[PDB]
Amino acid sequence: ANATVKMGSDSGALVFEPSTVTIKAGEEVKWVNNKLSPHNIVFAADGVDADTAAKLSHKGLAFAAGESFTSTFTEPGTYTYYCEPHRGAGMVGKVVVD
Numbered sequence: 001a002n003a004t005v006k007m008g009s010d011s012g013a014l015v016f017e018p019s020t021v022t023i024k025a026g027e028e029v030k031w032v033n034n035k036l037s038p039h040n041i042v043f044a045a046d047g048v049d050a051d052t053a054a055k056l057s058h059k060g061l062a063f064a065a066g067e068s069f070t071s072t073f074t075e076p077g078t079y080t081y082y083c084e085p086h087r088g089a090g091m092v093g094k095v096v097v098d
């Protein structure tokens with residue numbers, strides 16, 4: 001089963017929910033653009049390789065509530081991601097693979 005997260009809380013708050021999700025080795029995650037546009041979802045090559053992290057790093061630029069993105073986690077790690085330009089707050093989230 002893939003996991004999914006929505007870019008900002010229903011009510012209209014920055015914080016991602018669920019902030020962490022679990023996913024399998026080679027399963028997907030989908031991010032759905034809710035609200036508080038523009039979003040990016042930039043992934044840090046923190047304890048994971050550059051290429052992998054880069055492919056997983058959505059440099060994509062979601063404003064329209066509709067354009068979701070997907071990423072595959074081939075390697076069983078933890079990935080951490082953040083939203084650079086998105087005004088200060090601390091858009092923390094991280095995915096955990098099985």
Ligand SMILES: [Cu+2]
Nearest residue numbers: 039040083086
């Ligand atoms: Cu954001």
